[PDB]
């Protein structure tokens, strides 16, 4: 590739000469130390590169070498159980050779070039292959890893490596035109991978949490945002979704978090366990980690590497969930990069194209039919931290227009220690009607009407909050006190789920349906018994209320017996007390 020398150094910008033939946005190696850089200019024989690392100590005359490719990632076996930075460098292998500091100019490989993998072919010589097909399988933890021809390659095969142990560097399939296929291939992070067809959302994404699954559901392949003031509970909720959801592969992105919180999430995760198999949780997750003192170019590319990896695991047919820590810091990094380039800020300090980048990030999520004929889906959950509290912050305003679900958190409900702190008066979801045909054909025919009754009862109680503010709740009417107590029971025994608690952090669908059915039955029978006119004040202290709270902690396998017990207790109380 083209090689040139330096003729100007001014901060992070380096002007090289002799670089005729270099392409825009390529990755260059600058200086004898070998610092990475990106070309953004072309003018005659000279090109302007922008160095990621510190340029102190460089001298005029040091060579510049181009790699000929833009920013890309290595996709292949060995990405699970790994920790990477914003530009896919393994943090564990760097520590082995260097120490507790990250010396600049270090060279490492994303995929371990010296680990043997078991190879099992699935094609024979003489076959015709096209981009996206499957040729070969590799075991990897509890998964089987499929070897894919790159989407831009078509040809005819006459070479098959027989079943044996090989590294990812060894060719396995050689085409008629001389193309050699390996176990890994590169892909630029800012170009979306092709698909056959994009499908409609018709299956729910089971978060395992009662309120998020019932009141504000998100489908498989949807997008959700969870904003709120600092100290609300975003991180624990995202970790709970990572632990208990039905997604096969989980990708976590750290876009510049604080060092101590990054240490917290780096220490906590290896101690977790996979609920599906009982093994370590890290065997199915991929971690992208950045701190505040990393180079600013590595912070901007953090969300693109994660989404490219998620799209790679989508093409193999799995279901992928992509959790992203606060994108406000990613937008701050983008603003700093734009200020480096003098981009005439528009909104507050942000570049005018912030919404385009946010849309390009969120549009990759969906349920598609892959080029190999299989079906895969990607779900994206992102966090926002508006500093002013109000949702008029420009990043929040740009995010609100391209998301389907919106799980707003509130700090005041955290002060009452009611967790999760979901504001049910501000949150909304647009996926309910599409998920309704799935609900009635699988869960229960009466599920949507029961859910609407629960939501209507929650809405009625919010309309009485003015009268409670003037006069005490005891002076209110018996029916109004009834609906207030029903709302309180619904909140404290249906919307509560403690995440630090060991058995309060998960809830299935059948348990929630049974709890809603019991609550509606109790409400209707108590409403009739009030007009019955017997023991109207002692209705609030019936022994059935113990059975309502007991269903929160009953096991799923023991759930039908306790459901029958609670229903027949409701019958024996309301029918035959008086």
């Amino acid at each position: 590739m083209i090689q040139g020398v330096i003729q100007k150094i001014a901060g992070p910008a380096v002007i090289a000469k002799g670089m005729l033939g270099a392409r825009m946005y390529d990755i260059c190696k600058v200086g004898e130390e070998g610092l990475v850089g990106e070309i953004i200019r072309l003018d005659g024989d000279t090109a302007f590169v922008q160095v990621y690392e510190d340029t102190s100590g460089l001298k005029v005359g040091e060579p510049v070498v181009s790699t000929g490719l833009p920013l890309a990632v290595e996709l292949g076996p060995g990405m699970l159980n790994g920790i990477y930075d914003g530009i896919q460098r393994p943090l564990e292998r760097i520590r082995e050779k260097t120490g507790i500091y990250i010396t600049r100019g270090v060279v490492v490989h994303a995929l371990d070039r010296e680990k043997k993998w078991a190879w099992t072919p699935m094609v024979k010589p003489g076959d015709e292959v096209r981009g996206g097909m499957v040729l070969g399988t590799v075991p990897e933890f509890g998964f089987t890893h499929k070897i894919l021809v790159p989407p831009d390659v078509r040809g005819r095969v006459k070479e098959v490596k027989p079943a044996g142990e090989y590294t990812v560097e060894e060719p396995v399939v050689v085409l008629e035109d001389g193309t050699e296929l390996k176990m890994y291939h590169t892909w630029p992070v800012r170009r979306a991978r092709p698909v056959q067809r994009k499908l409609d959302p018709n299956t729910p994404f089971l978060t395992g949490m009662r309120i998020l699954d019932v009141l504000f559901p998100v489908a498989m392949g949807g997008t959700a945002a969870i904003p709120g003031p600092f100290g609300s509970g975003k991180t624990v909720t995202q970790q709970s979704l990572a632990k208990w959801s039905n997604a096969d592969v989980v990708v976590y992105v750290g876009c510049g978090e604080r060092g101590n919180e990054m240490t917290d999430v780096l220490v906590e995760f290896p101690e977790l366990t996979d609920p599906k198999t009982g093994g370590p949780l890290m065997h199915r997750t991929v971690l992208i980690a950045n701190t505040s003192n990393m180079p600013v170019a590595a912070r901007e590319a953090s969300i693109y590497v994660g989404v490219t990896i998620a799209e790679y695991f989508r093409d193999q047919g799995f279901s992928v969930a992509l959790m992203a820590d606060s994108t406000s810091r990613w937008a701050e990094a983008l603003r700093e990069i734009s200020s480096r380039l003098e981009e005439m800020p528009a909104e507050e300090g942000y570049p005018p194209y912030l919404a385009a980048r946010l849309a390009a990030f969120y549009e990759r999520a969906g349920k598609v039919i892959t080029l190999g004929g299989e079906e895969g889906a990607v779900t994206i959950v992102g966090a926002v931290s508006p500093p002013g509290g109000d949702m008029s912050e420009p990043v929040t305003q740009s995010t609100l227009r391209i998301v389907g679900a919106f799980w707003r958190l509130d700090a005041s409900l955290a002060f009452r220690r009611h967790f999760p702190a979901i504001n049910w008066n501000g949150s909304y979801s647009l996926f309910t009607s599409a998920l309704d045909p799935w609900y009635r054909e699988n869960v229960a025919e009466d599920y949507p009407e029961l859910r609407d009754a629960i939501s209507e009862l929650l809405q009625r109680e919010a309309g009485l909050q003015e009268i409670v503010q003037l006069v005490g709740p005891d002076a209110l009417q018996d029916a109004e006190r009834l609906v207030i107590e029903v709302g309180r029971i619904i909140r404290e025994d249906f919307l509560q789920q403690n995440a630090y608690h060991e058995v309060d952090a998960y809830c299935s669908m059948k348990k929630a349906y049974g709890i809603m059915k019991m609550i509606l039955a109790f409400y209707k029978e108590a409403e009739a018994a009030i007009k019955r006119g017997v023991s109207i004040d002692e209705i609030l202290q019936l022994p059935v209320l113990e059975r309502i709270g007991r269903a929160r902690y009953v096991s799923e396998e023991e759930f039908p017996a306790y459901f029958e017990e609670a229903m027949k207790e409701i019958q024996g109380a309301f029918k035959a007390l008086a």
């Binding site: 003098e342 005439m344 800020p345 528009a346 507050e348």
Partner: protein
């Protein structure tokens, strides 16, 4: 009556003024950035391409 008057009249009136002042100050900063760019471009041209 006093609580309702304060809640419905005064607070949005102050908030709108705050928003208006913020927009004016931000527009002035956006205006002066353009002049700084122009004078930097004038500095670059005369100090490097004259002879």
């Amino acid at each position: 009556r006093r609580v309702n008057a304060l809640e419905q009249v005064v607070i949005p009136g102050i908030r709108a003024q705050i928003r208006f002042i913020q927009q004016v100050l931000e527009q002035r900063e956006r205006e002066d950035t353009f002049r700084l760019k122009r004078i930097k471009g004038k500095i670059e041209a005369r100090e490097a391409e004259e002879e």
